[PDB]
Amino acid sequence: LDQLRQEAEQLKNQIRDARKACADATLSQITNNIDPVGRIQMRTRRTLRGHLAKIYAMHWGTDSRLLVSASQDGKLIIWDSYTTNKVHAIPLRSSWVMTCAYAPSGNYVACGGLDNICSIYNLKTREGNVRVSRELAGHTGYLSCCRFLDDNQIVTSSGDTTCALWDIETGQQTTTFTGHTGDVMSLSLAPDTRLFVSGACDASAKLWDVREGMCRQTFTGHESDINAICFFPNGNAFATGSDDATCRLFDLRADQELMTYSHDNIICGITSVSFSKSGRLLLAGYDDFNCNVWDALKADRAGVLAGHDNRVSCLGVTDDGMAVATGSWDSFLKIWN
Amino acid sequence: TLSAEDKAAVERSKMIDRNLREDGEKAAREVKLLLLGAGESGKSTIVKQMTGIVETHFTFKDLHFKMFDVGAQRSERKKWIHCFEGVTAIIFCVALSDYDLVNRMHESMKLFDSICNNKWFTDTSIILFLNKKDLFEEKIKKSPLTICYPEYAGSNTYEEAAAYIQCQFEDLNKRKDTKEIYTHFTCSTDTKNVQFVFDAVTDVIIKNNLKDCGLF
Amino acid sequence: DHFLEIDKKNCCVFRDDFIVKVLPPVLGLEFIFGLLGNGLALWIFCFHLKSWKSSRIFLFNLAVADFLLIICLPFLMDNYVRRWDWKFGDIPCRLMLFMLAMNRQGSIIFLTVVAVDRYFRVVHPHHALNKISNRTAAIISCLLWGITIGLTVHLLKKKMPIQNGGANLCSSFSICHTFQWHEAMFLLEFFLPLGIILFCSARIIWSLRQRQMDRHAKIKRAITFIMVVAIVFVICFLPSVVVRIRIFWLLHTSGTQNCEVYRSVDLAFFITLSFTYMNSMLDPVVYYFSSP
Amino acid sequence: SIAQARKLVEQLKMEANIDRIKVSKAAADLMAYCEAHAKEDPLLTPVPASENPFRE
Amino acid sequence: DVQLVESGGGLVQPGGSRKLSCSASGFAFSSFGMHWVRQAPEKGLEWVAYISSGSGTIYYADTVKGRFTISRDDPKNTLFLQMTSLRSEDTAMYYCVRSIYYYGSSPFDFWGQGTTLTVSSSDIVMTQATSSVPVTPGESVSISCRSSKSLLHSNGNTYLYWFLQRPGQSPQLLIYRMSNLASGVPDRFSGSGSGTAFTLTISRLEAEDVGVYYCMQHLEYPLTFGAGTKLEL
């Protein structure tokens, strides 16, 4: 049966034709009138040194003061960034962890990794200690990302080519999204927590709807695995970082590639990206041992944060946009401002 | 210039730091091995002799060994292999009885070539185990080794064939001076595989200590 | 003749004519080579280095100890050109003597510590001391410096400069009869560390040979480096001790009344003492930077 | 074996039924949002040390 | 159950050496700084002693310094206070409160039961002015407390705590750091004010709410309580 194969071929050809006919001018042509942002200099304000292995994930609290970090020594550490103090140190059951999350209300944290199980830890207990609230199982591959919708729901992305939306109370997979063809390595929730995006090793990204659970849009254009993704603060665009030493800015409504951030010097991949509060600076962590910042409109480099002696693995920006946190494969976790 | 609660918080943070340092010191004295095979190669026995990752465990000669078996991690190998950088040794298992067909020996050779010549494992030593020797002897009683390897001009005896297989598997190494591999034929005797693993681990530990100070 | 009462009976003290044209050139060559080595070694140890380890801490301590002699050499050649005379003041020469004794003691002690560390790393790979904290290394170094000060602080009490006509030489080694009160340190300073270093080196080489690990090239290179360190230490530290035991035997056999006997022995002893500075200047080359 | 092909056909027919705005309009919208909210970006415009929570 | 029991009371002749024990069950005793707080038979509360987690910090009051000692046993979850050379002014009821300090914690949250002891025959001063207030159900009441030194620290915290003691019971934390509501406290209770002037407001006052209200400062040791405002009818 090749008739339906030809149907798919003609449908994708029509999709390409519609996308091409909807393009009239690039974002660079519009933004060339914007004055250059100028050189951006950032200095290390705080340095948090508690870990003893490679750091694989970190997440900022909602209050822009507390953060949580995960490394390979089987420890989850809660840092008070203002005074570099330690609040909690949670020993993990499985030392292979590749993700971390912080609840918006600040009550729960989440962890996961090569053990195919997402653990949820409760922070505020009458007993005065941190204990594992709930273990979620059902994935057949390693977990690569997990994000909190609220105190009762969670979204997980695994290497079994599928994504899941859970229910912490019952502990069962409320919904499952299956539309990929490779490992899924990233996850970013929209500001209204109604849709989200996922980036896969298939060299593509997809826009999922949480409420009912089917893929609405598929964005392609990369050339290798996608390691990170992040939503624009407006909620109508996102940025993907891949292994071909390039970043890309896609738009939801235009259903098209908007711009590409790449320079001939860089040849190494990208491990994590994030935006700024106003959506003007696009930060990106590379394997070149240093992070870069890009003027998101003109696609010009405007600063390099080089203070790490290994590959930068995690990167985040506070809610008020007053700081940046970078964690590399050396145990140190650095704060820039 | 701090309040009472700030001083108490600082004291709590210091206690947390002390606990972390003690845990790291305790956990820095273990020997971590990574176990790799080719499915039915014979990883069962090496393990039983002593849903994701499956860490086994043992204490031998006052040394704590933790063996990590990936097992059923049916996904991309390059997307999680770098998590295992820094392991003391890689225990590769291969069966001498899988030259019949359905090519299994060639798959094991391809896997060994991929693992040995890797950017992450540029200095981690590999302990090669050749098991299922008795069934290989039974097979070589009648069938020749020419089926898997079309060469010779030598002979069809257990010793020469085993030496040929060992040389072929050692030939796949490319970092001949930054990496050393050890080959052992598994024996039914109790304390022969564990002793060999201990000797290889010691050797790696001596080399690591010499690298630390700088003398080597 | 050449007599002079130091504190007891007398002390045959001499200033040979040739001394002006023997020691100053050797000392200048040592000064310049020690500069060109130590500067680079310390710069790479404080600029281009990785995280501090216990061994690295011990090597840095040894570098401080052998730099203490570099900062004191100019006084030495100033004395040697002026035929054993001071004009720089009392508390000054005393500081020079204290620095010299501190340099010798610290260098020897830290050499023995490094040798013991190597022996424990190669012979006992799974012992506790192989993974030591940086704080423990700091405490050990501080304790070693403290005991070194303990033995060497006696030299900072007596106002040594003695009347010698046109000179007030502040030399710490005179042909005295006296007795091994503070002396015999010059002997124990070398005899015990020689035994410890030789035993550690022999055990390391024999264990690395028996284990059949002498196939990788850098293993043989490290064996040769250990042997070279041993030969350097033995070569630098003996001529002085040989002349010292010879003059001790002469003192015990012949009383210190006929100073005419001690003619060549003073010159020989001081040439050997000049030779002794060779190890301190070779340390920035053999250990740091020549290593793999 | 063959149901995934029908699933892919349905997914393509769903994705081929969404209207898209002009690229220039989207560029102008992103431009306007950035211009409007540039004033509240402490990273974009360095903040004085009086209210900077990270001293020195 | 986070129960917390004390023992070691009774009648002691002056010059005795009575020792009080306090056993805690139901929580991680190892990571909770523990205080000992006394109360006179008719007067208000008065801080007595404090020991931190890990026993690295110990504080005593001025009236008890050199006579009382405090110690912990973490393996068996016990807190001891040894009293020596008892005087006639030490007759009181003792409580074994707990407090854990970190960013966002609520110290003094759980109070003990109380042990009765009888004996035969530069500090921040905080006043509470009015002692008795006539109230009716369904009304709104305000309690005013006033210190002598401003409690607004440089960082921003205002260390002041509001406690409520019901008749025949032990005090329970109501408000910590002058604005934060303790766990299990209804919405009606609220706190406000500024430096050296604080006010606790109860809206829609109802029964099982009368008793005594105390204001305490945590700016610097020794901790000082107020006289206490009493609600009746």
Numbering used by the authors:
A (entry chain B): 4 to 340
B (entry chain C): 4 to 53, 182 to 233, 241 to 354
C (entry chain A): 8 to 299
D (entry chain G): 8 to 63
E (entry chain S): 1 to 121, 124 to 235
Report text from the authors:
For the apo-HCAR2 structure, we showed that HCAR2 could also form a stable complex with Gi1 protein in the absence of an agonist. It seems that HCAR2 does not necessarily require ligand binding to activate the downstream signaling transducers, because its ECL2 may act as a built-in “agonist”. Particularly, a hydrophobic residue F180ECL2 in ECL2 was thought to be most important, which was observed to rotate considerably and deeply insert into the orthosteric pocket relative to the inactive state. Afterwards, the single-point mutations of F180ECL2, F2767.35, F2777.36, and F1935.43 were conducted, which reduced the signaling activity of HCAR2 to varying degrees. Additionally, in the apo state, the residue R1113.36 formed an “ionic lock” with E1965.46.
Hydroxycarboxylic acid receptor 2 (HCAR2), also known as GPR109A, is an important metabolite-sensing receptor present in most mammalian species, and belongs to the class A G protein-coupled receptor (GPCR) family. In particular, upon starvation or other extreme conditions, HCAR2 is activated by elevated β-OHB in vivo to reduce the lipolysis and free fatty acid formation in adipocytes, thus promoting efficient utilization of fat energy stores and preventing the development of ketoacidosis.
